């Protein structure tokens, strides 16, 4: 699970804080990236931490 703006960072060759320190993709990566909104299940009014 990541932020809305960080979906671009889940790609080969992207510089992102999550890209450098959390999940790294190889340059020659083959496969598919799937991103969908999870506001209904992965959010809380008080703050889901």
């Amino acid at each position: 699970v990541i932020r809305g703006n960080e979906v671009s960072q889940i790609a080969p060759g992207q510089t992102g804080n999550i890209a450098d320190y959390n999940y790294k993709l190889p340059d020659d990566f083959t496969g598919c990236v799937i991103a969908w909104n999870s506001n209904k299940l992965d959010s809380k009014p008080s703050g889901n931490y």
Partner: protein, 49 residues
């Protein structure tokens, strides 16, 4: 009198000079320096350059 031999020497030097000169050609890329391309760009676009 000795133009023919000198011409051959000239051609060889000129050919080498041209080949060396060709290293300074962008060839449709942002820069002619490989180190600059690696330093400034990520591998997916650096590979293209």
């Amino acid at each position: 009198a000795l133009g023919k031999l000198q011409d051959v020497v000239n051609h060889n030097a000129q050919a080498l000079n041209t080949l060396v000169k060709q290293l300074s050609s962008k060839f449709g890329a942002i820069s002619s320096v490989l180190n600059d391309i690696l330093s400034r760009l990520d591998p997916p676009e650096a590979e293209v350059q």
